[PDB]
Structure 1
Amino acid sequence: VTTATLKRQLLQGILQIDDTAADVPVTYGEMVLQGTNLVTALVMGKAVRGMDDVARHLLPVNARVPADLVI
């Protein structure tokens, strides 16, 4: 991240531009806190994020956008 003047200073002779477009995710992840780590949120004061998996261990679409990628 730069200012406009330094970016114009950098794109002239120093850094060579790779691609003028990139494809980036378009969705936030989510955390819901229901099920096994809802009772422990209310009977005790704790909770674990992957409480569906970490209890088991014991016993997507993107979009192409205009960008400016340098090497």
Structure 2
Amino acid sequence: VTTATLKRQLLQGILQIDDTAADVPVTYGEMVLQGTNLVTALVMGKAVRGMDDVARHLLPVNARVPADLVI
């Protein structure tokens, strides 16, 4: 990230542009807090993100958006 005049100064003759667009994600992550860590969130005071996954080890579409990628 920089200011506009420095962007111009950089793209003038120092850096070499590669592309004008890029495919980027178009969605978010998501946490739910359901299942077994719900009662741990209510009865006791703790809750782990991947509870159903730590228990087992204890025994999308994108979009082509214009940008200025330099190498």
TM-score (normalised: structure 2): 0.96
CA RMSD of aligned residues (A): 0.7
Gaps of at least 5 residues in structure 1 are none
Structure 2, gaps ≥5 residues long: none
Deviation of residue 59 (structure 1)? 2.2
Q: For residues 43 and 61 of structure 1, what CA distance do their matches in structure 2 show?
A: 39
How far the C-alpha of 1:41 sits from its partner, in A, is: 0.4
Name the residue aligned to 2:34. 34
Q: Deviations over 1:1-56 (max 9, x none)?
A: 00100000100000000111100000000000001110000111000000111111
- My pick for the range that moved more, 56-65 or 8-17, is 56-65
Distance in 2 (alpha carbons) for counterparts of 1:25 and 1:51: 27
Segments ≥4 residues shifted beyond 6 Å: none
* Structure having the larger proportion of residues in helix: 2
Alignment identity in percent? 100
Matched residue count:
71
Secondary structure of 2:21's match? strand
Output the CA distance in 2 between the equivalents of 1:36 and 1:62. 33
CA distance in structure 1 between the partners assigned to 2:63 and 2:51 by the alignment: 31
When normalised by structure 1's length, the TM-score is: 0.96
